[PDB]
Structure 1
Amino acid sequence: VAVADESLTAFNDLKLGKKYKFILFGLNDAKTEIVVKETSTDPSYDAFLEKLPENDCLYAIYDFEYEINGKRSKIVFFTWSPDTAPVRSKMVYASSKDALRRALNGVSTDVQGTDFSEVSYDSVLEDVSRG
């Protein structure tokens, strides 16, 4: 599958303009391209977590800001593939991931999310700041 132009534009606007705090991406209906499913300017990490589907897959880019010894920001890429998502969805999202991820320059951190503990604020804060 391919990456929709709109997906790269969204990413550039987040990267260069801080236009969004996060972007959710997903396959279009035809399974032919990765499109933008949702964007948000909400600074609360919970507003991102509450958008993660129980039984479906997605990709996300999150502009994660944190304290250093001022502040720093790192762009985090997520795959979200919960155990209860259909196995065919998990597989098509997995085979299609590189199409999106390879097209994105300036990602600092990659998260492979399969459950809440792997995408929690504390785990991700640990990933961006300490690893």
Structure 2
Amino acid sequence: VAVADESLTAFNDLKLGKKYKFILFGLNDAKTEIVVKETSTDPSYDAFLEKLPENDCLYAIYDFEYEINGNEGKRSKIVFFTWSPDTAPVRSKMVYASSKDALRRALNGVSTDVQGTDFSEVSYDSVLERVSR
């Protein structure tokens, strides 16, 4: 579909400005474009997970910061999440699956990509392992 202008601006603020810790994107009612549904500066990973619709899909961008060690500080990588819970309607999964690339191709700067179908696939530990290793 079309990527709302607002969605790009929000990605750039997070990317160059650290303005938000994470952003939740979704399709509008008209299913014509990808808009931002929520933004947050809340650093707790649990506040992120509590916002993933148990029976629906969405796209998410999270600024994951972790310790690159050797007493060397932290590192931060932008993770793109595709959230398609096993319990979401086949109709939802279908439309999110095909519109994904429209959004994913427009966001320059993403390090990792995570496909989430259940909550354990998006736990702090699974994502840490994926950005670390």
TM-score > 0.5, shorter chain as reference: yes
**CA distance in 2: counterparts of 1:57 and 1:77, whole angstroms:** 14
Quick check: 67-76 or 48-57, which moved more? Answer: 67-76
Partner SS for 2:128:
helix
- Report SS of the residue matched to 1:38: strand
Structure 1: runs of 5+ lacking an equivalent: none
Could you tell me how far apart the structure 2 residues matched to 1:69 and 1:79 are? 29
**SS at 1:16 equivalent:** helix
Superposed CA deviations along residues 95-130 of structure 1, whole A, max 9, x for unmatched, are: 000000000000000000000111000000000011
Whole-angstrom distance in 2 between the partners of 1:22 and 1:54: 18
> Per-residue displacement from partner, 1:62-89 (whole Å, max 9, x unpaired)?
0000001180000000000001111000
Aligned match for 2:77, one of 64, 74, 77? 74
Residue identity (%):
99
Deviation readout 1:3-30 (Å, 9 max, x if unpaired): 0000000000000000000000000000
CA distance in 2, matches of 1:15, 1:114: 26
Matching residue of 2:91? 88
What is the TM-score with the length of structure 1 in the denominator?
A: 0.98
Figure out how many residues of one structure are paired with residues of the other and give that number.
130
Q: Which ranges of structure 2 fall in alignment gaps of 5 or more residues?
A: none
Consecutive aligned runs of 4 or more in structure 1 exceeding 3 Å deviation: none
Query: 2:68 & 2:107 partners in 1: Cα distance?
Result: 25
Per the normalisation by structure 2, the TM-score is 0.96
CA RMSD of aligned residues (A): 0.8
